[PDB]
Amino acid sequence: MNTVPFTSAPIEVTIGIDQYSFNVKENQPFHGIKDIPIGHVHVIHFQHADNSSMRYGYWFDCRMGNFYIQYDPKDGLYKMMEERDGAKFENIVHNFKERQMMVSYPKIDEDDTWYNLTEFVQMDKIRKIVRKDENQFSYVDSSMTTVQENELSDPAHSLNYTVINFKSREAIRPGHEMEDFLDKSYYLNTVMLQGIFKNSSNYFGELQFAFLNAMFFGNYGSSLQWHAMIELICSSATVPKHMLDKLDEILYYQIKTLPEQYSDILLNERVWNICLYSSFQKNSLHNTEKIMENKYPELL
Amino acid sequence: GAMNSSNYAELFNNDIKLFVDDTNVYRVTVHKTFEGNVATKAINGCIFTLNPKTGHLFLKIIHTSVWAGQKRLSQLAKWKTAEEVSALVRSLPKEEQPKQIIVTRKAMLDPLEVHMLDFPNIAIRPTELRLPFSAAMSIDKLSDVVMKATEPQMVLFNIYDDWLDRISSYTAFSRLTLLLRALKTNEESAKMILLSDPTITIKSYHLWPSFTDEQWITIESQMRDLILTEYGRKYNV
């Protein structure tokens, strides 16, 4: 059980931790979040009572250090920072708990939701998509653009997701134009899985991280990335059976966790109807297909 | 973007462009089998690739042998069209390659796009115009060379005969599409109009009769009248 203390809460803000969130009032005595489950990545995020644009937040793993939050009045936002002085850190954390000014990470014991949404997300891979190697945690917000989006402007602030493009030389072998465009198995298994991602867990991890960024910050390019990685599998005639079954579980918990009122910008009508109903893999997503019908039949 | 009535005169500038029409690539007859079921039989086809400024036509003959033992033929036709257009571009010297290719049917966008990945500075465009290039097999000499072919073969033609010696590309193309529109709505009458007078012949190296300027005016009037009649008939107006 780990802790992330906060120095203060100077401005009214809604604080999120993973899929939980709390309202905190201007200069309320709030000094952190305790009982955070070790063993997974986590994300703590923010939305000011005054600017309901620009949701932002930090990806972290508590095994990698002691982290805390502090408001910066020059830059106007809650910043994550690292404390290298171990004793000084436990001293702050203990005194705040004794005074009981920290909320408890509110996990239900039956609940595998966060594990299921983060199964394959690793902090080391996050740090390659969000390159800022002087911090051990990663910042993302609503407005950050992806590397693919920039090709069609500030690279320090980019999401360096893997670029997928169905009408590219990379995806299409000379002489197999028709074959490789109707049946992306070669782009999936040779180029992407064997070539770039090396194995499917890294692929699934980028997929899952892209979804969480769309969900928690409404990052539009992440939403585009998530739909692309889904489409590439569903459009490949030849997929390892283990990936198919794992994909059905991954998507199910994503669809399950989505806020009901966001299904309009976050779910691409074309991709989902193609995957569930036209693609090679229409019959391999039984759980995902069942929850989509019973919860968003409008879209279909 | 898409080609429509607004940006129509762009056809006649000095950017090389081609139209590609795939309507006659995969041609079938439908008949009944001994046991009563229905079967198709393929006949020879053609890609219609045309430079609307110069008249040059690249008529790529599509011999039935290409379908042998293949499935999903109507979908394959689109990919075979694109493969052949792409090889034609590759065979032309650099300064003759087009800057744009305009497909008469939007289903050809994705296949051509994929086949042209090697030519990223060639723009592939749809059109909103309802061009009548499917009536090309109504031109007697084009249908004749397609039907007689025994192997794949490319045949070259100037679809404007010698008209550009006396009129502009704009006017040449408006005559060509009016003749072809007429041939499409009522082939029998269209061809009657063109041939009624045995004293106007087709040169051996030409596709259309050798009308004088005044005789072309009478013909164009006769083709207009044909097209409007057939419209009243269709719609009861």
Explain what this protein looks like in three dimensions:
The complex is a heterodimer of chains A (300) and B (237). By secondary structure, chain A is α+β, with helices and mostly antiparallel strands. Chain A folds into two domains: 1-143, Sandwich (Substrate Binding Domain Of DNAk, Chain A, domain 1); 144-300, Serine Threonine Protein Phosphatase 5, Tetratricopeptide repeat (Alpha Horseshoe), CATH 1.25.40.550. Helix content of chain A is 41%, strand content 16%. Chain A has helices at residues 86-98, 113-118, 123-129, 147-151, 177-182, 185-197, 200-217, 220-234, 241-257, 263-266, 269-278, 286-295; strands at residues 2-5, 13-17, 20-24, 32-36, 42-48, 56-60, 67-72, 77-82, 103-104, 138-141. A five-stranded antiparallel sheet of chain A has the order 3-2-5-6-10, with helices on one face. In chain A, strands 1-4-9 form a three-stranded mixed sheet, with helices on one face. Chain A has a two-stranded antiparallel sheet with strand order 7-8. In chain A, strand 7 and strand 8 form a beta hairpin. In chain A, helix 7 (200-217) runs antiparallel to helix 8 and helix 9 runs parallel beside helix 12 (286-295). The termini of chain A are far apart. With 237 residues, chain B is of the alpha/beta class. Chain B folds into two domains: 9-163, Prp8 RNase H domain, palm region (Nucleotidyltransferase, domain 5, 2-Layer Sandwich); 164-237, Acyl-CoA Binding Protein. Chain B has six helices and eight strands. In chain B, a hairpin with a 5-residue loop joins strand 2 and strand 3 (38-43). In chain B, helix 1 crosses helix 2, helix 4 (169-185) crosses helix 5 and helix 4 (169-185) crosses helix 6 (213-235). The longest helix of chain B has 23 residues, at 213-235. Chain B is globular, with a radius of gyration of 19 Å. Classes of the chains: A alpha+beta (300), B alpha/beta (237). At the A-B interface, helix 5 of A face helix 1 and helix 2 of B. Chain B: Residues 7-237 are annotated as: RNase H homology domain. Chain B: It is found in: Nucleus. Chain B: It comes from Saccharomyces cerevisiae (strain ATCC 204508 / S288c) (Baker's yeast).
